[PDB]
Ligand binder design. Sequence first.
Ligand SMILES: OC[C@H]1O[C@@H](O)[C@H](O)[C@@H](O)[C@@H]1O
Ligand SMILES: OC[C@H]1O[C@@H](O)[C@H](O)[C@@H](O)[C@@H]1O
Lengths: 695, 677
Amino acid sequence: KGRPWTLEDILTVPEVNEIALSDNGRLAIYAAEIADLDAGKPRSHIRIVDVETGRTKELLTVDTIKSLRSVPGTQDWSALVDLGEGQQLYRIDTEGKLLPLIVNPNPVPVGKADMSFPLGGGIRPSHIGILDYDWSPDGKWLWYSQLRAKSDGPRVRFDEEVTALLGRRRSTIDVEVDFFLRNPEGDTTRIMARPSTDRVATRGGGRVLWRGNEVQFRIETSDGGGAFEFVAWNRVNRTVRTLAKQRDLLSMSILVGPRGGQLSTSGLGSDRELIETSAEGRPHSYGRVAFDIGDSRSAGWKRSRDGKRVVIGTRGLGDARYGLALIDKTGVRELRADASLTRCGFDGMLRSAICVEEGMSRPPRLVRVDLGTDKITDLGPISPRHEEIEPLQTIARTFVSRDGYWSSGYVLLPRGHRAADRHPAVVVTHGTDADDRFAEPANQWNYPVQLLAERGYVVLLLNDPSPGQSKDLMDAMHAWLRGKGPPDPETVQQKLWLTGVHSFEDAVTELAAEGLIDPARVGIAGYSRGSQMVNVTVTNSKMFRAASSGDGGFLEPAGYATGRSSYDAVYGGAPLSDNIERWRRFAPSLNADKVCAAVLQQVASASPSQIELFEALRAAGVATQISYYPGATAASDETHVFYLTTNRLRAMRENIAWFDYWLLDKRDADAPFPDHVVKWDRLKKNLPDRCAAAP
Amino acid sequence: SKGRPWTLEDILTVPEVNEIALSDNGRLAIYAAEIADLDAGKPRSHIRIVDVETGRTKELLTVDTIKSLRSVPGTQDWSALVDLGEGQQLYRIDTEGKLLPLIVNPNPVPVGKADMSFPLGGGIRPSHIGILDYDWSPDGKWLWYSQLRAKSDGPRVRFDEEVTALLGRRRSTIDVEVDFFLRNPEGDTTRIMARPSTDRVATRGGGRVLWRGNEVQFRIEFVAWNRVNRTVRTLAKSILVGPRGGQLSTSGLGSDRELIETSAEGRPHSYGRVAFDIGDSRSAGWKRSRDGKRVVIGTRGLGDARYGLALIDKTGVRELRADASLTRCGFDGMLRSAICVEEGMSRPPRLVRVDLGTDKITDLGPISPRHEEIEPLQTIARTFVSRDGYWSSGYVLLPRGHRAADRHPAVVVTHGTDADDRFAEPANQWNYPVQLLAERGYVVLLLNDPSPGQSKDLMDAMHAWLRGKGPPDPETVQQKLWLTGVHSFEDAVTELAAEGLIDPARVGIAGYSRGSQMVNVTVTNSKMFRAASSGDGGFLEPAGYATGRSSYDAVYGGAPLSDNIERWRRFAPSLNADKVCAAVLQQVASASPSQIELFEALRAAGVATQISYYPGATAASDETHVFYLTTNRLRAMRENIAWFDYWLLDKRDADAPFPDHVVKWDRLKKNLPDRCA
Ligand SMILES: OC[C@H]1O[C@@H](O)[C@H](O)[C@@H](O)[C@@H]1O
Ligand SMILES: OC[C@H]1O[C@@H](O)[C@H](O)[C@@H](O)[C@@H]1O
């Protein structure tokens, strides 16, 4: 029959971002990131699979594993793993054991921590011995880069160097990036050194071109006005070159097709056009396609060795299901599957492939795909403990709003649900991330969607209106990234934000007409992008009784000086400029007078924008609470997506108690912070008369 | 021998003495001089013992920091809070000068501005504190000391009022508790209380504690503790106390005042018409004899701007005649003899002993012989009255080799009223080498804000700024506290320029903190100054409202986004950036959002501006509001010289600490908007 959803099952759901296949397709290897209670943070369980037999063997558990590839010229594998001493390049033999490949004796601190380097924009605090690596096609040469802490005295900084320190919450160290090359004889020389201002050099995972006597990779300099800059290292003369191009290089570009040109999906509406644009600019169309292209949530892209076949990850329109598409000179062909294929890996000749089969109602599984016959065979499950959970009832629905734009998403029915039953509702929204995938933390975050359903809630997971359905939305997006118009700021607020409030309202009213939702008790929750939507809805809508905004702060005037270009499209200028009235009408901090609801903030960054929303809401009589979740120690911080099991479990349980209280008038003694329920009773009695219910 | 000119290292190494003590027998005295060490990069205190009759001094040793230097009541020894580099502990000084420890905390907690420390305040460099405060029982047996204990609880999720307090955090911190201990004469220490960090008098608080019978009574944020019963008690419902047991006050205003001792229930008593103001924190302070019949207070004259001593008793008030200012003074218990530090604007620090009976001053010799070598600079005490009738006092510093009819450029240095008779006070001239500029040909005018005690208009505005709300009007608070000082600066410059002293074409203004506000407001509301520098500023800017709300609400009436938005736009210097045709340099240790905003606003307006951010000894520690690092304040003096010489004098040098700037300044000068020419 199955068992219900425990909160720990939401915490222990695995994530597979790394999967690789042998050049002969006989064996494969992957890693499942699982939250560990004893360690308090996620660990990656490395497993080896025999694709022919289907049997799997577990090898080890590391802290992190990244850039998992098969070593050319051998049957072995290479990866960047951290055993707890810092991330180094390791080799994994065909028998499933790992040994060091290149070890940096002095890894540098990275992430949000005291005296670390802000590398990946607030990733986990750790040490990086080896940053990035790539094999030559023959496997003889090895290219790798590693971070080197900058040993130097504290120096007087100046004009632009001070303003970059505006938002510093902790101590930082400066570094440089060293690039090395390893000949077949085992001797390594340093190619060049790049500063910290080079953002492609510090990011890693970049492209590198092995051609002729040269090895080529891309770099960024302070100037690029704008341009594309590359450096080529001659393996013979041992010299360097500098390339500057107006248009980016296709050889170093992702998503290239059999013709050799860039792939894109243009147009809007019911479907898109898949075109291949040559470097000279003449397009080649493969016809009409039902999917989008090139999403990091898809299987990525790979091209064969002859260049006549490519495989691209596809997210279809309206089914929000990830899949594969095959492209040769004849044309595009999709391949059907009952579920979505998110993370994949491919052989050398691009014939056999292995993928992670994922679904909204089904847990991740491993599958082998024969790309010639479009035949997939089921391998063993990934997480068996989620396979024993009885599947919740999940319905995929698209809603149309009063402004004509459609919003996709899913509907979670409570356990034991009977037809024609009214239930309270919780709306969880982050970006486009409601799709066919299993309990993706990038969507539901700390909101226990599956647990809310077990307790009788109807959870509505609803995406933002897809900007690709209309040029009105997409033109506002293009103005958002450009930092200028057209269109004007008043329209940017309508299409990017305010129309989502209508899509949320009109989705609840429609389901209320079905008899599935009690409009009296309903709530909205989201983080990041969803935080903006939550904060804009509760200001511009009276429909929602309670709300939870995870780690927000965009659209508030406090964070302007950091994000000017992102704010200028929305508000048309600075808060104290002549655009001040544009800030008063929209920004939620100044509009708190319009807020009647329970607004809870779960905040890891303690930013001045998150604080300004709380003080403005609290000073207006609104019932509100802010929760600052800390790092593993006072020296570190918490990431955007919480990596600490203790902060995840409580935030989940804090949302359970927050919505059970305001929506359902339900109080629990085993709640994570007991003395709060009396504080919320005081927040209820002190509510303003403005918030009185309709007569 | 006339002497030798000044040097940056002379200004840097000027000693300052905050600790001086005298034995109850008056025969021996001990003090400590804080001097900047080039080798260590930070200042170090030199403990010195003095023979009060002869003036003989010998060097005991050199320590990092020494505080709370006093004499033990029971014997001829001494006790002080000393940090040898292992953290600040409680040390006893032998009668022969040797140092032996008394209370030593094996677990000193880190404090200061730095990573994973505790942010005390006042001002502090990153350091470890084993023992915080101490006091002796009046008989010298029982010992009461305060130490700082780090709270070991793990990281906790914070909540509403806790999170908004983390708004302005630039680093990691720890939370601590204070433990109060009591040491019996038999050598056993027992713990009394434990108090949270929220208590200020227990964290940065002073030395106020009272012994009554068997009870030790100290203040918390009043409580009594019995040494016998071992029981705490919150007692039922002092400082600057005269001989009659009441509060001492100075009432009235103008150029003359009247001493008042208010009776316990408020019956006033006048000691007569008096020529000074009450003792500031920079004066000799206040001390009362255990007899209760003699009280000595530090004084500050009005016309003299000099520090001194006033001795009051049942007879009356006596004003001690001194040719220079007496800043820090050690005393005996009965207030009979005193050893003081004598200094002036042109007068290097000296040691003098004072007999309070006969009011005779006796020179015990200089302090630093290095500054005795320097030939003095001409310093004229001058008072400028503005167009509004308010007067401001200061010193006119003439350049080396100044003759009649000669005119020179000018630089105005202002902090609060810190311009008085004192020798190279770092709290006034800060990082501006006021003495070097005179050697280089400048005419430096050190001018204070208009003396607030001269009018009821100013004192009401200062009261409203401190209270946090009106009356008076926000527009009057802007005019009385700030804009009327710009008029005082303007009228003072015109007074000297008409007299044939300074050239109006080349003149500049410099200041830090309170002087930065007066620099930022002056360059916006006045065109008379070509160049400017503002140290460690950022007040009056909109970025700091969410922290300093209480301070801003009186000036602007409310938040910048409220209906008072128009009040900010007329005044706040970052919003006026297009009114500034001068060159604005910012020397900044805090890298605060209010200082960056003023820079980005001035740069967006085409104004020539630069912000120099000076770091700490490590990336894990910051630099204090007053620079304690030798390298930082050494080239900061060089930067101001290079800044004013380029803009005012159009002079270049390779001695500039940053050679890349002189070219960058050419680009900034060339891109100046058409408004300025
Ligand atoms: O880069 C493409 C990757 O495809 C994967 O399927 C292979 O296992 C890797 O060896 C290869 O690097
Ligand atoms: O002002 C009183 C003066 O008395 C003289 O006897 C001393 O030599 C001076 O040092 C002192 O300043």
